[PDB]
Design a protein around this ligand. Sequence first.
Ligand SMILES: N[C@@H](CCSC(F)(F)F)C(=O)O
Ligand SMILES: [Zn+2]
Length: 546
Amino acid sequence: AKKILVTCALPYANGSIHLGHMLEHIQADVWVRYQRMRGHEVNFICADDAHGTPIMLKAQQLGITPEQMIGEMSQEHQTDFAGFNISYDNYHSTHSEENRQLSELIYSRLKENGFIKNRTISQLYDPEKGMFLPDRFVKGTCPKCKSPDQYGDNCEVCGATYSPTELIEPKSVVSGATPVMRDSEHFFFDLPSFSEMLQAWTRSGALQEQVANKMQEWFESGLQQWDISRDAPYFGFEIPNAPGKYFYVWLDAPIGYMGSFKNLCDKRGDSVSFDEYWKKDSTAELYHFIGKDIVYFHSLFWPAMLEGSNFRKPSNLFVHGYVTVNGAKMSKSRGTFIKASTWLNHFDADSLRYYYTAKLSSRIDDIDLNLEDFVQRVNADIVNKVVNLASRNAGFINKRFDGVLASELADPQLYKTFTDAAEVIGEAWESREFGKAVREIMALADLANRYVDEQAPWVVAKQEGRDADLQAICSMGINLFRVLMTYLKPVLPKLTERAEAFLNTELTWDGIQQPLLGHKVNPFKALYNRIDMRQVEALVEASKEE
Ligand SMILES: N[C@@H](CCSC(F)(F)F)C(=O)O
Ligand SMILES: [Zn+2]
């Protein structure tokens, strides 16, 4: 039994979960549920990324403590993920005692190992508010076209880019006062020192081809030292021995993966698993599911930090692309910027889980949610191919045979074709070739429905003395359904629970080898209903209104 620790990127605490986040959490959950079905020890870990200036300032605007604000967002995030049945073993926070101790520990080891450098920098400073200003909190007039009210390092009118120090008549977005250049000592992590170690990992062949290719571009550009400190005022962890200095969010953020796991172990009263998973000699596997925008961070900075602090590194990084709706980036004006909570007001979790899974692969390509296609695919595959197998046969069994399935398989050869596919389908789930697994499963679903069509139960049912044949045909269809729902169990948790209640049995991967014979099933009300474009229209309109 393998020991596996799987994570999803930690969501920022200052924004609601949207369909973009869901692609990642659903992809990981499918993989995690499959690994659990194969008997491995799995720890699915996540948490909110709760530190930083943006958060501190938002809390101040709302007139509440950052602690209260992140606490509310944490609850909101978990409610949404729970609604999509993302099976985390623990969901913690980067703002925790566990993360504080681990951040201090790692920093101390990096400093002791000579990987921390002191450097003085110059940055825009708000003298009224009394704080250094990140680029996005500095506004002014574009140096090129002279357009007013531009933010950060770029102009939204002429498209020019520049240092905020070039803005004409600069103004603090926080207080409106004119910012000035101010010096401050910062602490940098010497990432360049790990260049050779990182280059070796890149060419090892573990990472996705597209990722390794990207990394070569970054090595070509040249690794730089990374600033891991921030001056007060700040919402985060104070740096030991450095009054007024805090750990920059990106230093403590990934350590949150560790903090969340330590929290889980501590709550379980488990005093050995943390070290067994994070020590350099660990035989456990560590996987991070992440999006394209944070690959540089997880593939270079993170492994380097772990190495420098004597901890094991990721076994692999699983990168997915962006989510688009109707072919384009989510658009608020078009109502395609959809929140996870909003989605659930209109559709169930299984529908989106299935759709995403049917399009996912082991590559980093973008995933498109075409709403028209969504309706067609769900109705065609879930309702008409898979659920149909149960709904078209269950009635006769319950009404004509007291809910009892036949004592033998009507077509053992066909059943073997279904069980024989477990190896390829499981390997598809394992390798993250989700689209391939779904295609294979639906191909079997087509074969199953062809079988039922060929036997014509609707004809046999009205013909005198054909009771035995009817029970045989319908029981065969239900057993094929049993196998299909087993392969789809990691994808559709809710439909699976309903299927298990109907079948009177928990679905296990190895269980398909023993078909249900002389077995009692229960009656069921709509296992899964059709959806329509009117619902999609409502979702879009509701999203526009938000
Ligand atoms: N909050 C970040 C992800 C943090 S993953 C970590 F490892 F950096 F914690 C984002 O949403 O992009
Ligand atoms: Zn301009």
